[PDB]
Amino acid sequence: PKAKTHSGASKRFRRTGTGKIVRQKANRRHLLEHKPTKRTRRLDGRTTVSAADNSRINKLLNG
Amino acid sequence: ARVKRALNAQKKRRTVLKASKGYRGQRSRLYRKAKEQQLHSLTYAYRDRRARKGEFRKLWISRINAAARANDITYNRLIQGLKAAGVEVDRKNLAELAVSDPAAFTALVDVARAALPEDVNAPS
């Protein structure tokens, strides 16, 4: 039985060239009128997964 | 590869039963009940082996105190005087002298009394 990858984790996380798992940031989907553009710029782009969550996110991506 | 565990089990069972040989009741017959007592037996052996030194020192001290007071001196002042005189005879052999060589014990008592200060209670 092949280890199935977690669909949600695969859709929410990516690995860079060096293997860094990257993710997008929450609170940037709607309710944006009250959010200053500095906040949305902070929430923009991709950030490396926190070391605490890295183990479980790797588990979900690999199997 | 089915393995029957009698050969391996009976080894420790015989060990514990032979060790508990002499125990009263189930403790000498049943391995499980012998094992409980064997735990206690060996814990007690360790504890009493540590405490045997204190028990024998207590016996020696009691005998030395008896001999000292027979010689008209307390045990504490006898030890103080022996230390002042530099006599390094342990309490074991002090009790051995007290029993087997009372004359030698009296000589040591005289040495200790001579080495004691002129006034044991002096502020010195």
Binding site: H6, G8, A9, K11, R12, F13, R14, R23, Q24, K25, A26, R28, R29, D53, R56, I57, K59, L60 | -
Partner: protein
């Protein structure tokens, strides 16, 4: 000689199995599981986080699409070309595969900035600007085929 009884594993090769739950002198009783709980009798799923929105559900799904028609290329660098063909000569997909620079059946894209110093007739599916510049400076010929 070496007979069968002279064969032994490499030092540090084999390791004893951790036979758990065999007396208290080893990982006994609970077998490394500790006292009561879920984990005392089963494995907690990796995606479970105690009931709070898991990370893989509170984080937004990555933006974009995958483009099932993407034309990805197997890349060759002119530095690898130099190492593989110090004398020069014609270069194409066949001999790139032979030298082990690309997959056997793929669209090869040549490229590079690693000081191409050999006249080479390189025939790949595509080239980069620096690939063409390096080929020309070295005196070779880039051909997209």
């Amino acid at each position: 000689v070496i007979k069968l009884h002279d064969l032994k594993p490499a030092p540090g090769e084999k390791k004893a199995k951790t036979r758990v739950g065999r007396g208290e002198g080893s990982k006994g009783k609970t077998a490394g599981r500790g006292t009561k709980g879920t984990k005392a009798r089963k494995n907690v799923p990796v995606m479970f986080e105690g009931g709070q929105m898991p990370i893989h559900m509170r984080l937004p799904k990555l933006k974009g699409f995958k483009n099932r028609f993407r034309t990805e290329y197997q890349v060759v660098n002119v530095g690898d070309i130099n190492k593989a063909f110090p004398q020069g000569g014609t270069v194409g997909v066949d001999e790139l595969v032979a030298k082990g620079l690309v997959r056997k059946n793929s669209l090869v894209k040549v490229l590079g900035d690693g000081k191409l110093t050999v006249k080479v007739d390189v025939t790949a599916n595509k080239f980069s600007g620096s690939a063409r510049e390096a080929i020309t400076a070295a005196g070779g010929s880039a051909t997209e085929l």
